[PDB]
Amino acid sequence: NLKDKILGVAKELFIKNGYNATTTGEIVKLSESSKGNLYYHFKTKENLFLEILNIEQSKWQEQWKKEQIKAKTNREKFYLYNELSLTTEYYYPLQNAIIEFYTEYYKTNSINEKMNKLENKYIDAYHVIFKEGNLNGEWSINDVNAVSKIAANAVNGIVTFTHEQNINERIKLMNKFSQIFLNGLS
Amino acid sequence: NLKDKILGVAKELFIKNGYNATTTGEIVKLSESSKGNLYYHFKTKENLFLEILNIEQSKWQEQWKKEQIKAKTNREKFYLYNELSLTTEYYYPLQNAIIEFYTEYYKTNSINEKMNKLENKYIDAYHVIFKEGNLNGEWSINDVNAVSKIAANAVNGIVTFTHEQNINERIKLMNKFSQIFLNGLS
Ligand SMILES: COc1ccc2cc3[n+](cc2c1OC)CCc1cc2c(cc1-3)OCO2
């Protein structure tokens, strides 16, 4: 394939090197491609990037649904989502690339034109869990949305700013977190 | 001084042009030093930069020392340090230089050495708030080292991954975190 072969090197580039660190030239070089390929469906570089997030985000979002069955009550759905995100190979490994891209593009409002659409799948997992949890009376959350975002980010914090130490110690901290969090919701 | 003079100018460059773009050649000339003197003092740009960060960390620690005097209880110091971490980084000139350096030298397990000591100094702040919380019974924690790593990285997450909402909602979200988190300790 051509496109699915570009996104295959581009993603690997954004992960290994930063966002800025990987150049369109590089992608085209280890893909035997040209400049044209990037025009009709692959416009700007930020387009290629925002696209890889979308894919990744979904591969993750999907692995979560084929793996959340192992969780009975939402309280378990909370711990488990926060645990899996630490071991996934999807999206979360690009967080660094994202940090850059989210600062190298603040003046250009053409970003949030589809950026926040991604931010939604980001807090959706937490939005369902916190809500369906009210139903199951597992807790009483009145501001589900704030909490949804607070959780997603806090979690992304622990996954991202601890990507160097013993993976097992990580699963430990993240767990004490979920625990301390949910417990603070009642 | 010629050492501080290198640091002064170096920090200004990094702020103006970033980490990658600043050459040690600029630093050397603009600071009126020599390649020899710059090498003898820092060896590399990586260390020089790591050296500024150390100094910034220290300015942060003093600022925090003079600021926390607005928080009587460690319960308020917690809210305050968190908010402080959000507001101040918002207009931090180096932010961008750090992001480059960080997401460009975290691949080298070498630089991760001094890099860990640093972050830890930023986490001690919490360790301290929690230990003094215990000794004052605002809460009970036996794993102060853990929660501190948690809080610090959850806060950090909430700061970094939400560089989009309006500064006013962000603080609400952070004070909402501070609240929940702190409540999950009793
Ligand atoms: C010279 O001024 C400085 C210098 C250095 C600063 C460093 C940090 N902050 C302000 C600073 C500042 O504010 C004025 C905000 C809180 C914070 C949390 C962190 C972190 C670094 C910092 O890494 C881990 O989590």
B167 touching chain A per CB within 8 A: no
Closest C-alpha to A78, from A39, A119, A6, A132: A132
Q: Which two tokens stand for residue A36?
A: 């044209």
Residues of B whose CB is below 8 A from A153: 154, 157-158, 160-162
Side chain identity, residue A42: F
A149 touching chain B per CB within 8 A: yes
Closest C-alpha to B90, from B176, B150, B151, B159: B159
Q: Which residue's CA lies nearest to atom 3 of ligand 1?
A: B60
Q: Let me know: does B9 contact B27? Beta carbons within 8 Å.
A: yes
* Residue whose token pair is 């990094």: B14
Residues sharing a CB contact under 8 Å with residue B6, sequence separation 6 or more, in sequence order: B27, B28, B31, B33, B37, B38, B41, B42, B48
Q: This structure's resolution (angstroms)?
A: 2.8
Mutation test of ligand 1: which of B85, B156, B158 has the most ligand atoms closer than 8 Å to its C-beta?
B85
Per-domain residue ranges for chain A?
A: 1-49, 50-186
A111 touching chain B per CB within 8 A: no
Residues of A whose CB is below 8 A from B19: none
CA distance B110 to B170: 35
Q: Which helix or strand (DSSP H or E) is residue A6 part of?
A: helix A3-16
B1-49 shares its CATH topology with B50-186: no
Residues of A whose CB is below 8 A from B17: none
CA distances (Å), origin B147, targets A128, A139, B3 = 27, 23, 38
Q: Which two tokens stand for residue B169?
A: 């909602």
Interface probe, candidates A115, A142, A161, A176, chain B, greatest B C-beta count within 10 A: A161
Q: Which residue's CA lies nearest to atom 15 of ligand 1?
A: B85
Does B67 contact ligand 1 (Cβ within 6 A)? no
Does B89 contact ligand 1 (Cβ within 6 A)? yes
Does B83 contact ligand 1 (Cβ within 6 A)? no
Residues of A whose CB is below 8 A from B158: 150, 153-154, 157
Expt. technique: X-ray
A154 touching chain B per CB within 8 A: yes
A180 touching chain B per CB within 8 A: yes
Question: Class assignment of domain A50-186?
Answer: mainly alpha
Q: Which helix or strand (DSSP H or E) is residue A3 part of?
A: helix A3-16
What HEC string does chain B produce? CHHHHHHHHHHHHHHHHCCCCCCHHHHHHHCCCCHHHHHHHHCCHHHHHHHHHHHHHHHHHHHHHHHHHHCCCHHHHHHHHHHHHHHHHHCCCCHHHHHHHHHHHCCCCCCHHHHHHHHHHHHHHHHHHHHHHHCCCCCCCCCHHHHHHHHHHHHHHHHHCCCCCCHHHHHHHHHHHHHHHHHCCC
* Residue whose token pair is 């759905």: A77
Does B60 contact ligand 1 (Cβ within 6 A)? yes
CB atoms within 10 A of CB B1: 7
For A:20-59, CB contacts with B below 8 A are 20-21
CA distance A68 to A57: 16
HSE (side-chain half, CA atoms, 13 Å) at A71:
19
A161 contacts B119? CB cut-off 8 A: yes
Q: Which residue's CA lies nearest to atom 4 of ligand 1?
A: B56
Residues of A whose CB is below 8 A from B133: none
A149 contacts B154? CB cut-off 8 A: no
Mutation test of ligand 1: which of B60, B101, B123, B171 has the most ligand atoms closer than 8 Å to its C-beta?
B60
Question: Class assignment of domain B1-49?
Answer: mainly alpha
CB atoms within 10 A of CB B159: 20
Interface probe, candidates B79, B160, B166, chain A, greatest A C-beta count within 10 A: B160
